[PDB]
DNA sequence: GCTACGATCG
DNA sequence: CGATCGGTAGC
């Protein structure tokens, strides 16, 4: 079975120190996709970059302590992609793209746009630019799973607050309708929502009041898969027996 | 300190 | 409903 796992460890050295390294094995996945580094490549360990023997590839941002992201698989990769391609966005290290044989998997890190309207109208820019990228990847026909971060929750379903929310960033009308757009028109499956309808699955938690601990959260991690792959998912889960982080895990595995 | 990233309550 | 009520990672 393929396991690949989807994991924001809010800073690879704070989560080392929380487990999350034995994690990667004790999980058994075959790839694993970080994101939020928040360090550059001279910050990180030789076991950072490539956990249990694993290839690793990753792409930091040029600011210190700040977002990036990572791919790391059992398997060698045929070739590996440093970046969308585009500057605006690659400086802040936010996608990287590995090809093994006939799949792809990418980690991938969109930008919030919380702290301010300036970065809203960033995280707007990324979703124009990146839309593109997904309708080309779709039309490659290979199957490719695109794990990470979007920083947007799609229904009400998918937090615990969507009516107090729907004029914050990550739960605006824009913003739903884009993933809308990405699952219907450009033909991905939202891996999770189709395995399990019903199931909220929550994989991120506020630092506000006691929202862990309330299960006041939202799914804004995920697997956004091809659908010849998509049909062969068997199950998935949000890992949470730990926490190495304010977001949980996400573990999918593929009958392939 | 700084940068950067909405749950609670009146 | 709108007003106020931020813990954390790394610099």
Redesign the pocket.
Known sequence: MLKIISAN??????????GFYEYIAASGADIVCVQE????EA?LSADMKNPHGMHGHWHCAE?????GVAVYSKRKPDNVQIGMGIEEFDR?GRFVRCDFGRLSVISLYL??????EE?QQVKYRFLDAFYPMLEAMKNEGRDIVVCGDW?IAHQNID???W???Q????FLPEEREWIGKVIHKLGWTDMWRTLYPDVPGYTW???????Y??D???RIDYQMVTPELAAKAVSAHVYKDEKF??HAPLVVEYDY
């Open positions: 460890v809010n800073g690879i050295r704070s989560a080392y120190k929380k580094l928040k360090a550059q910050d600011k210190r302590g700040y977002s802040e930008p919030s746009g919380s702290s301010a970065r920083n937090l615990k607050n009516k107090g929310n004029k914050n960033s990550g938690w506020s630092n506000r009041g006691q929202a601990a309330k006041v959260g939202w982080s304010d």
